[PDB]
Amino acid sequence: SAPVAGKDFEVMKSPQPVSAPAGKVEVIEFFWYGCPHAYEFEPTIEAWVKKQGDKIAFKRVPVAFRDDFVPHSKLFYALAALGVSEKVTPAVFNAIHKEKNYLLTPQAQADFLATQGVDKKKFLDAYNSFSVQGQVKQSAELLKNYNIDGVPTIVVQGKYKTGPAYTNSLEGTAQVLDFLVKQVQDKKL
Amino acid sequence: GFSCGF
Numbered sequence: 001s002a003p004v005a006g007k008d009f010e011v012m013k014s015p016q017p018v019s020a021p022a023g024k025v026e027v028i029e030f031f032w033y034g035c036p037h038a039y040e041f042e043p044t045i046e047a048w049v050k051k052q053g054d055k056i057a058f059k060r061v062p063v064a065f066r067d068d069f070v071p072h073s074k075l076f077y078a079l080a081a082l083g084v085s086e087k088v089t090p091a092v093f094n095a096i097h098k099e100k101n102y103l104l105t106p107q108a109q110a111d112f113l114a115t116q117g118v119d120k121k122k123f124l125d126a127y128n129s130f131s132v133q134g135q136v137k138q139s140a141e142l143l144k145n146y147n148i149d150g151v152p153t154i155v156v157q158g159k160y161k162t163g164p165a166y167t168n169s170l171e172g173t174a175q176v177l178d179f180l181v182k183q184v185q186d187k188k189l
Numbered sequence: 190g191f192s193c194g195f
Binding site: 032038164166168169 | 193194
């Protein structure tokens with residue numbers, strides 16, 4: 001009943017540096033605002049990340065498979081630079097997957113986010129800032145370092161990848177993620 | 190499985 005290596009998750013050949021502080025298990029979700037699989041997975045991974053608390057260091061990395069969606073990576077880091085990510089992100093997803101507003105340009109984003117209480121001037125500055133440009137370029141470099149081919153992909157301690165591509169279900173992805181983190185904590189992975 | 194990948 002336990003997840004099968006090479007089937008339910010992938011043991012990476014070139015594991016990556018881990019920024020978690022020893023006690024914690026690192027968890028990275030490669031996601032994309034426009035992926036409906038990452039959209040439906042948002043409440044499941046959220047609640048779980050909060051359930052682990054001090055036991056993990058969770059972070060997200062936006063994925064842009066084509067230049068069309070680089071603004072979605074700039075959007076991710078522009079909101080974080082403002083500290084409004086956790087507040088507006090539910091509205092971002094819903095705008096894309098229910099309101100037929102895909103937020104593909106900085107102007108459309110500044111327009112939408114202003115209805116959510118975000119000052120247009122301050123958002124566009126972060127969007128065009130060199131710091132957000134650098135975070136976007138780094139996220140694309142992480143895509144290659146982690147050999148990410150699809151989303152949502154979850155990486156545990158920079159060694160093990162899982163996701164619906166492996167498990168064929170979001171619930172199965174959550175179960176695998178939970179299994180891997182525990183195996184890490186027990187020095188079995 | 191399934192995922193957004195391209």
